[PDB]
Symmetry: D2
Subunit: 439 residues, 4 copies
């Protein structure tokens, strides 16, 4: 029940200035056809069209009179400094805006007390900041009074505010937008979605996620080495994922080293987990367990709890697992806090520049997202009403099930054929050697 109206992104009234550098075009939400190939063109399975992001010929704000505002909120995420850098440099080099302000430590930065700390963003101040993790502005969780914030925006003459944060941040962003139009102030509030878990809807990718999976795989390589080094060794790795398991699932498949992958979308029992572990220890002396922070909220720190419960299980069963070892790893610090991969640096730069192009063109109350290889605008209202989750019947989760322990699979039948294939390889290698001597 998402309607075309839900996808209509707001514009501030008027586009009375030319673009210093450079029709709304659309892309289909679902590019799959209703009917088979035929004489006429195919029609979408969905009625939804998404507004494409692009530099416009006419823009709302007089560039040389425009102040741009930036705020970063919530958990850090690889790429924040890139988004800060790109918004700042696109503003200055392309549109030549009067001023760019950075609000310190999240929404607190726009409160009358934190407005003191706000920083001037020039070319010099952002030159290399993309080389470092975190945010030069700083970040806090938690809202402020939208009234008090819009006072600061009016006071500093801020014309556009970029809100870099999760669902909660944009929810607040739309409330600033509405508080602004309620006074009839000329303010654009534009969201750059920050979410390492890539669980934004009307999106296939958010900045930081690809970088985060790189680090997750590194964490798993370490866990794997620890675990295979012990007799009945268990590496438990916690891989982000508050409400979705996209990092857990991709890391599990990429690493090719996960035997059990625990995600919120597939909530199983403590007892079920231990029988997967038990089946792994039938024909293996090590087990790597990926666990999303959001798994087993009905069992909070699932990392420590799963580790304690695995230990308890192995201790109860010393009988069969005589010496055992269980190492817990929390690489959260290492996954959020790094600078982005080159690919994520480019993605961040592209999101930020299109964000400025569209905000200057008077877009407001929207996020910028990337979907079907294209950059789209999405109203915050819809963006924050629905969220993304693993499809347990889809290709990614199928690849997790192919690698992870499955109680279905005949373990010892599967192993018979394994051996026959290996003998067939050995016996050929055996003869080719024999040949070389006499020959």
């Amino acid at each position: 029940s998402v309607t075309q109206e839900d996808l209509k992104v707001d514009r501030l009234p008027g586009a009375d200035y030319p673009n210093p550098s450079k029709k709304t075009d659309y892309i289909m939400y679902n590019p799959r056809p209703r009917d088979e190939p035929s004489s006429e063109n195919p029609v979408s399975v969905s009625p939804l069209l998404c507004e494409l992001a692009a530099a416009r010929s006419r823009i709302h704000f007089n560039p040389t009179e425009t102040t741009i505002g930036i705020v970063t909120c919530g958990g850090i995420c690889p790429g924040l400094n890139d988004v800060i850098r790109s918004i700042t440099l696109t503003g200055i080099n392309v549109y030549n805006v009067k001023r760019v302000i950075g609000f310190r430590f999240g929404y607190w930065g726009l409160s009358k007390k934190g407005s003191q700390t706000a920083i001037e963003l020039h070319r010099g101040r952002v030159t290399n900041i993309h080389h470092y993790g975190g945010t030069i502005l700083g970040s806090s969780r938690g809202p402020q009074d939208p009234k008090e914030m819009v006072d600061t925006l009016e006071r500093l003459g801020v014309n556009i505010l970029f809100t870099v944060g999760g669902d909660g941040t944009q929810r607040g962003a739309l409330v600033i937008s509405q508080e602004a139009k309620r006074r009839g102030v000329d303010i654009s509030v534009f969201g750059v979605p920050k979410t390492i878990d890539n669980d934004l809807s009307f999106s296939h990718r958010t900045f930081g996620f690809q970088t985060a999976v790189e680090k997750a795989v590194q964490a798993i390589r370490a866990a794997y080495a620890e675990a295979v080094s012990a007799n009945y060794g268990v590496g438990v790795v916690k891989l982000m994922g508050r409400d979705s398991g996209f990092i857990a699932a991709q890391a599990a498949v990429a690493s090719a080293q996960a035997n059990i992958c625990l995600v919120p979308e597939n909530p199983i029992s403590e007892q079920e987990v231990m029988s997967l572990l038990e089946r792994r220890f039938c024909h293996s002396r090590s087990c790597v367990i990926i666990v999303a922070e959001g798994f087993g909220q009905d069992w909070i720190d699932i990392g420590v709890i799963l580790t304690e419960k695995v230990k308890a299980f192995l201790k109860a069963n010393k009988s069969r697992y005589p010496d055992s070892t269980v190492k817990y790893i929390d690489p959260s610090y290492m996954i959020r806090a790094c600078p982005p991969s080159a690919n994520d640096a480019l993605f961040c730069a592209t999101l930020a520049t299109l964000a400025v192009h569209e905000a200057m063109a008077g877009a407001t109350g929207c996020i910028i997202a990337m979907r079907h290889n294209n950059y789209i605008l999405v109203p915050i209202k819809v963006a924050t009403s629905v969220r993304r989750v693993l499809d347990l019947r889809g290709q990614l989760w199928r690849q997790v099930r192919e690698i992870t322990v499955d109680l279905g699979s005949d373990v010892r039948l599967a192993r018979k054929l394994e051996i026959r294939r290996e003998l067939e390889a050995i016996n050929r290698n055996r003869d080719r050697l024999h040949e070389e001597l006499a020959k």
Copy 2:
């Protein structure tokens, strides 16, 4: 001239019969162009294009009896980060999912299937592929050049190979469909299925090929080094050659990602030696360093090649890397007048970009392409490649795939980002510089006061 892709061109071949169940359902499609003809209205939107692409997926009925099927793998041409992943995934998907009788790896490209190289061919089991994705190159090995299709299909028949995966560029797949035709010519049950290898990401009906994301990571590293060398010298010039035989996707993305390129030379934008030197000259107006990205395919009109081909059917190119470096030196030497001491370092990181293991993102992509390749080949697909487009995996007949290629849009967002960073002759040098200073003073004088405040 317009290309003439028709829906018939996109219909991928199937070997006749799907008479066995899947150990582990109609063809679904995705629209080639998901942009609508008309604005939002009462009815659902309709594609600007009539073309539909076949989606890749595991099928319920399959052509080959899994337990009786031999899978063959061959890797051809320049190495590319991910080849071992594709080898590993084809091997493990075959064994763990379909439980195929045997998997053969053909050594050193098509040479591996010639009666001479068929000696060297290797048995691929789980043990033999366990960790091969951790290393660059190909455990099979790779050569440029075709062999006698007759002699190759002899080997395929001799070893009872039922599917052959061809991992290589346009030339390799062109040969793949020639194996397919030589096979049907004898009425043998063979699938020939392509996994596109091209680091330049210039396959059409594709937004991404395996290895490209990894290659851009390395290019940016090469640039970071060049940048350090160049900024260290007074009138220092780093020239970096970044792959790109016929397209500049690596050059362009590396240039934007690095944010350290001042001149980015790609084949799509052929400019003169004289134009390049005036970009350099303008850089040295208000800077003592310049980094120059150059695609191996740029400036094919700057010199004349021998006129020959390498064995794969690529033009033997004029080493534009060495030539651009010599011409920059010549220019700086002619103008010692204004560039009194100058330094020009040339860097060729080709070795480092192809030869590395894949990024985790490229490991996943390779693994996904390879498994869908096996799912579809088992379902009797043949004479096609697997590609990724609009976030989805599609099948494409080799015939169309090898008749069109991909190239930078000089009016598109990526190239716009290159032009925002690289030197622009347009902006009036010394006016442009006045405002630069005023902005920097305005920053300094604020920093100046905020300090003063803290004391009193």
Copy 3:
């Protein structure tokens, strides 16, 4: 209570007889005569100033130098080599396994090489079943991966039962890769062996990431471990500077010494408090360092060694660990919560990168070091050395009897250059906070105002 190490204590045992020539190092390849033991001075500092006579060591001790010998004890083609890895993994174990295996096979051409699985358990009659054959194929690339292909356990086994296995498999040399506890057991295997008059060499390759072996300036894995520590700190630093009154607590190995903590702290240049066992301070002292940091900064990074503050059952029924990382984090939180007054919003992130520091493959420099230690270990064990470790000291490879090696341990000198560099970077209650800060500013203004004018110059002219 002084240590009582005499020159006799540094004489390393040799099994009686060196009755075979060296396959690789021929006696006729040298310039000078005699295949004797050469020595290096324990302490190369002189008693007296420069004078007419040569200088004399401040110490009487000489250490035996490690090197390939012209005569060897074991008949190479009849020799079985045994390898066992014990305790915490450490970057480089697979290199040491690989190098011992390949030096044995390629240089001496030994009959066979056995890998004992999961520590000393591998030599017990039960674990002797699991022992692996080590050939060229089985070790080709194992140095590319962290951990140990043999596996590792803590804990001793019955020396009697172990030497049964060594005799049963015809093992002539056993390399013991492990910490102090492992070598202590190694010497006990050696003595149990000589007690039956079996022809066995027991030779230690010291494993200790903390680099706290004595008669040593470097153990394999330590350089790699400091690389990872600095990476962990970069992350903690980013988390911390991102929060208003942000605190990164990083635990950096160091059971009984703080060499990783100290080097990481200096290298990173990002540590404001560095807590090592050698400098035991109070909870109250720590909080006043933090307090002084928050006078003129909104972030603090705290390095803490596992072994710091030893004087400071989980729900599932297991005994809960000595974990200064969790405790320091709780106590910092408690302090910040008591003082919300002045630190209104605060954040404390704890990082335990132990997993990431031990479990990685070695740096190229540590790969070389591992390869060198392992090959000299084989050269010397073949030359009949036993009851000793191989160590690296004053840029040279030496042999040390296990007895001495396990009676003394290494520790930070709090008056030495490394710890001085930590004190220069970390918060110091000495420097008067607000005067120190005045001059900071004046220096920055003096820089700004010059930059300011040089710009002004360019414009109109």
Copy 4:
């Protein structure tokens, strides 16, 4: 060989009339800590009469800290760590000694000429904060001398009291000439060398800054060459690994990588014909060959990198007969080895060298370098330091490890190969039975 204790006596400027703001006689370390006689009841005596002055912070210092200007110049090829040395000299000066001012001279000795003295930079805490995170030198670097007269004019003009010269043998040679020109006019100047040489060929040294980082990169270059080469039938990777006059990088990289089959260093000059017979022997029972070559090898040949590659190609052409398809890839990773930031171990080493350099220069040391030898930091007069150089011992343990890995013309090809096979069969046939057992 003929080096005297007088040669090792390091100069001090007359007077140490001020206390140390942070923190006493000269201590020494034995040049050669090997004993003359066997172990005995008394302490052993050095084989050598030579003692080196140990570097350390002193209680009395020559320069009045608050009146002292420090000068820094970086010369010749960049080297991983230059920015660390710049940073540490600057911060040790400011934070420990509290010096009046610190100047950075741009683009080498040219920076001190009356023309380049214009470009010289003021170095404060802000200007050096993160410069160690980047390769190259924020000061810049040129080769070549300037008029020592003209340079000492600049030093007098800017009131420079200490000048740190970061560069190779040629740079320090010039440094001592500045020192002598300074004392020749009544100028209170310390000239103190921080040796820069990636090849680690400084004498009275076991390690120079950048060398450990450079070997890390060399091994990475080799891993790439190896992958290219093993991918081709009769594949040849030629890698050039620095080494103008010594092969320490070539040798360590070769051993560390374990992937070099031929390692060509200046210390072991062999013929083109000798190289090709190593290659020939490799291709008897192998289809790939990796060749490490130091830039200083074969200066008596036909840019040894391009020439060796051409000569290998020429050899493979019309031996097509036996090497039917062949491939020869040349790699020059010089750019990548010099231009990177230092390893954490090299960052620490750089920081340590720079701080001790300031401690000792403040204590009036001059006409000397700081070096690291037998795990200790020593001072060495430039005069001796630049009169002798370091090179591979072909009879030492490092080169022995290169010979163990690289192809050896000694071992009888076909007999050597028989035993290879027997060992492999003995492995295969055991693996073969253990499998059979399970069925």
